[model samples]
Target: MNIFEMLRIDEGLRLKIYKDTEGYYTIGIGHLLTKSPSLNAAKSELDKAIGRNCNGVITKDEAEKLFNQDVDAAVRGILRNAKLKPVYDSLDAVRRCAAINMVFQMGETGVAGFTNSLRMLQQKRWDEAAVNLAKSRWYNQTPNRAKRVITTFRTGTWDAYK
Candidate 1:
């Protein structure tokens, strides 16, 4: 099976938004609500589907397809940001993945609000970036996830959550 299909099995498809184990609002196979255009589009499509059929729920295949589309848009959002793109491109794969995850969770605009963190990233100051990330409201709201991202930034490892 492809990675997306594997992820579909691993994450489980949900037609509606629900709180994850970490208490975050998620839908369509772990697509977290970050006020990004991707989530907005998915919700809009789901609304249209529900309007057509009140009792309708998206199938697993549909959810996986939507999740993949949303992820593509989210990645574009990150790359389209002039200020963040350079910083993102300069990082290692693991750290870059962490940044992409942050963008997926926070949106490009939301991530832009982390000025200090971005500045630190631009300077290749991994420790300072981690510290700055920890100081944000995002960190306060999602410590477990924040710690994982921050640790990834600092150490360039993909095993932070493990």
Candidate 2:
């Protein structure tokens, strides 16, 4: 069976997915997968001159435009390729994705990383798990957002099928 089809998604997120108009279809940093139609606009400009070579033949200003577009495409390509099931299947994958996403949003070496959370998640250590999760890179990025989500999942706050 398709894991996504089998796994139960939260109703609210499911609704959000349906409402997405942008075609940002891939699972996000979290296991939040959706076929969003709200296309990221800048990607179009990048697709125009991907493999074109640029010697000093071009003016500095023109070269800058091409370089910027190329970088955007490369970064977007990485985000576009990320998948959900691979990470959903294991805690390590979850940690990896979370870390990668943090870096993607912030920077490659942003934050101290999720050392505590990674340890707890690997052991399936649920109770009092708030401490570990609090150490995540984006823990404070959205106020108490991470706290709420982590608390719910760690406590089995969501209803699940046996």
Candidate 3:
């Protein structure tokens, strides 16, 4: 079933969903999902979860695949909401995107599990953040790529992910 169907969402809730997030949906070069109430808000939230700041150029179809992976992640977070996993993995994207996206979506405390690590990074201590981030199983998702991207972020060309 589609996200709208899964969420049991009607038009009214879908509209509220997107509006709640204030229309901030862009993932690198891709337009993750269409911004329309008919499409279901949860799916859009899933899209936002994986939207923006990953490797390189991607088409909308590729973005949808990535978004679906995020839906899986969200489902995993809440057992009652579990949905079937998509056939395609987007594993590579998931590894990197989820790591950063979790922090972005959840806020520092959300990922506060990585407090000392983030603190190290914030203190301009790349080495420690690198060590801490690497230690998290989340980093194993895209070890090499995640490192490179974090390095880039530390150097301050933050737009590189965009």
Candidate 4:
């Protein structure tokens, strides 16, 4: 399936603000408010979306908007990243999205720490890259999601039944 839908499913939509597994104040579709540049903007946006003062609630429409924005931010981060740009550009569409998906989940800076993984991916060493992906807390925290990304890297396909 598409990256958008894949992430939508994995991240899950929420109409109310809640703490994520990591205890971050998150809302919408996995929108981590602490990481967002504008807490004020998010508050106003949610207020506008819900037509109220926002008692920690957001509409689905606004949730989708934030989700798309987050994905776009992740993609832009990858494109501008010193290490990930070439690695991202070297792959086909599905594999390209695999990189983006990981970046979306972990942030560009976090994924950049995977020096061996990115290098193996750049070298077309899918097996090695997958291994590198497995050797992380990200995988341990969300094994199923990480598996979907790693499977895409290994097979250069859409998903692992995600």
Candidate 5:
């Protein structure tokens, strides 16, 4: 699968700011404008204007730049952990992409919690990995995307689950 397309589609781009389930102002490929707890702080991180506006909008380039930073962070976070190196080594590029996708969504620490599933993947027990992952709240919460990742693990493909 196309990394750009996958990342783009998975979060999708939103030029318009919106309230997320947590009631935070989110925009630009699921970017949380409120993630830093202060709107100004978040805006500062984005190198955005300090002034307030009725309709918070962004450019495609703005979102893409933010997305690039996020991907960089996610990739580093996944590899920076000592315990996951061998596990990370076990994957092919496609599966690695899936790993990056997960890291992008859940953060490395969050992914590290799936001990059994990670072990299954490390051991190349793909079916078991899929099963282990399927039995998760993460799976239940976003099966639309999770199923595609799970399928990638199961088949070692990035077909993106029609």
Candidate 6:
């Protein structure tokens, strides 16, 4: 229920710039470029305390705080998708985390497109759901990530990677 723990479940830990769902430049725990007019202004206050360019690398503590705020907004957006609610609520913590991560990475609409996988999940067909996940272009583009999620889907276990 806490933002801190929820963020760790959803985003893990990231200290560098990475692209988000819309491919916008993101850093500090899914802080999107579009969310602010300028990184400089949004991060200006931190610059004095942290002593660095706002757009540059951020610390884990910084990322976690940012992620807490970001995920609060992101989760509300994700919850707007009624179709995902059943699967999201029905799964265990690890599986629910995986589903939410997909929503964060692909947006609700994009995640909705994984019809077969969703159907398999609804049916409690873990192996089929994992297989369906692997068959997608997302899987091909991010095989290692896909494997980790697929494993989690099948086994209901969290897989931490570096």
The TM-score, computed over Cα atoms with residue i paired to residue i, of candidate 6 is 0.69
Q: After superposition, how far is residue 116 of candidate 5 from its true place, in Å?
A: 0.7
Over the stretch 122-158, how does candidate 1's per-residue lDDT look in tens digits?
7889887888789888889778767867887898765
lDDT of 4 by residue, 33-88 (tens): 76455557667656765467976786788788878888999999988888889998
Over 4 Å off in model 1, which ranges?
1-13, 19-26, 32-56
> All candidates' lDDT scores?
0.68, 0.37, 0.42, 0.81, 0.75, 0.67
How do these models rank on TM-score, best leading?
4, 5, 1, 6, 2, 3
Off by over 4 Å in 3: 1-110, 157-162
Candidate 6, residue 21: Cα displacement in angstroms equals 10
Q: How should the candidates be ordered by lDDT, best one leading? A: 4, 5, 1, 6, 3, 2
Candidate 3: how large is its RMSD? 16.5
Q: Residue by residue across 1-162, what tens digits does model 3's lDDT show?
A: 233222222111221222323354334222234455444553545545557532323455654455456455554543331121221131233333333444334433445476676456545575666667677755575454455445543454333333
RMSD of 6: 5.2
Best by TM-score: 4
Listing every candidate in turn, what is its Cα RMSD in Å to the true structure after a full C-alpha superposition? Answer: 5.2, 13.3, 16.5, 3.3, 3.2, 5.2
- How do the predictions measure up, each by TM-score? 0.74, 0.34, 0.34, 0.86, 0.83, 0.69
lDDT of 1: 0.68
Residue pairs clashing in model 4 are none
lDDT of 6 by residue, 1-162 (tens): 333454454455657656554455566665654445465644564454346765557888777666766666557775676777777777877777677666666777778679889889988899989888888878887676667667878987654432
